[PDB]
Amino acid sequence: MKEYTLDKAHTDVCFKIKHLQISNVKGNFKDYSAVIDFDPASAEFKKLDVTIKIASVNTENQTRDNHLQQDDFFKAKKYPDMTFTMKKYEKIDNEKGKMTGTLTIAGVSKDIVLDAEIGGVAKGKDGKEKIGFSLNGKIKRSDFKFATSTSTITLSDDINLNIEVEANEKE
């Protein structure tokens, strides 16, 4: 034989190990329209109608937003927009209510509950009305047969919705 001594500068004692990490994908939508009927005297919504153009999805990532439009997700060619239609608003108090409505994603429709939290009915700058309010709720991908190819392991079945609204009076 023969003996050797390491050269520490060009020797590497290395390892690789695979691990999972859970993370939140958080996105908004840049382009959407709404019809808002709300009566500050009773603090009750009367009509809430929302259309969101899928094309406008923004999850802080160019390449994933594209992939969202594809057939294993939104199918944006065939179904260009998702829609919400209020069917019922059930008042809890002047700050809180349970909003039921029809959500449609990729041409499939389920009724959902959103938690309305009225964040302040004012009469703003110019003496015309403003209102803040939030809508919050969880929906299940499985309920809308969304991304059915993607397992509920890889991507959660649960989608948390957070709609934050400021809104001004008509004309």
Added chain:
Amino acid sequence: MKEYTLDKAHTDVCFKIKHLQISNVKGNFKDYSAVIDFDPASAEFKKLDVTIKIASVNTENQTRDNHLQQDDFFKAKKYPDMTFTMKKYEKIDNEKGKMTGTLTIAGVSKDIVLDAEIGGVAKGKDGKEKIGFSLNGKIKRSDFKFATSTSTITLSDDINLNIEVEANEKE
């Protein structure tokens, strides 16, 4: 009632969805010693003995390297170093061999196989010997009861070892 029109600048149609991502944790060890007996005439290792000071782990992350020393991992107080001892080298050809040896991690010992790939026996700068060679192999955390508290879901049971060596002759 009363009608409102969104202010798009202070309205946000948001969602959150939890997903998993797989990733490789890749680290080395800054401080280790070796005894290397190798016979270039037969290209056979005769003795390979390695001690790696756990304290010197570097996985490009200060806070995780600490956490590696803790009791749910390396137990570096009680077991300050991990060791490899060659028991057998089985030659495939002049470039390749199957090295069997005892690995000890946190005072538990299993025999492993590493794949020796001899990357060039030269006689360098000053007319003294050098050798390159790699040792590659997979070990199972479960075999050494490592991180037993961490599931094989979160962190893989499989650890890939890659030892890259340059090494010079004695005295």
Added chain:
Amino acid sequence: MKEYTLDKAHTDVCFKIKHLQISNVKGNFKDYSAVIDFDPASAEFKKLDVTIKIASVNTENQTRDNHLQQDDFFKAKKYPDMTFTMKKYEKIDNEKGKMTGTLTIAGVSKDIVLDAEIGGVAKGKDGKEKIGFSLNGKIKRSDFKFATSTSTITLSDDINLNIEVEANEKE
């Protein structure tokens, strides 16, 4: 050389592949007490106070129910029971309400919302009162620092509560 022909009866072309499966752990509790104050004239709960003896957990598995009592879960020696105390009941209609209360698990307390669904106020067999009702809600393990050693990957952060009640009048 020499040629051979398989014996198919004692030859096996085999493979192993690791995959994940998501599943629901569903359990009840065999031993618990409650104080129920409810006014059928207004269909409003007035007091709801529940203590559940952790020892009585039943998730259709002997060995896991034990493991639930251990320190990486319930700590049943130190904290023998978990408790719910109603602080608020907010009526939606005669069938529905939003119940807020303090939940304590292993000596940690958070206020929760349960969805009360009144399933029928009758006057039963003997002319004494009965009531059906359900309480439903989701709580987060992280909110109560529960099983903190177990990742939110392996076991979901989300716990769905379903309390199904039948209940009779006093004395």
Added chain:
Amino acid sequence: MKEYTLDKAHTDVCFKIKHLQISNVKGNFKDYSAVIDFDPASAEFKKLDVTIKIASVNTENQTRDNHLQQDDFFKAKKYPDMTFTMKKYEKIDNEKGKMTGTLTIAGVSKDIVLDAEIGGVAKGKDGKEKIGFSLNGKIKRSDFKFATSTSTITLSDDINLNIEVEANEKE
């Protein structure tokens, strides 16, 4: 108000919690052919050629074996069989060797290493030759672009091969 006492027989304090479980999918193949050239005097394989009919997959599950034939897996219509062809056998000793060969799965081909473990060269019942031997190795789904739609989270990238052989002499 009014007070109620639970009826424990028709009251249920329930919970649901989602958790992951890792498990091994283990299958064989019922229908396959082989050409085996082996020289007991030198204990070296000379030729090893295997074709496995995908249709014959058996993973102890009727409905999954079907699903294996589909386009997100084996594509059994277009690619009815997978094949192994030995290109090299490198002897370690009389019991052990490193077999290199071309594996093809769904019309994609990679060279693999299997670990040959010769389990006994005998001359059996009738004075004609038999041989036992195993071939063992890991292959990566990603190397063969297999099940590319299924993530390496849900189903492991790693496939362990275990070929157990008994085999008799010609004619």
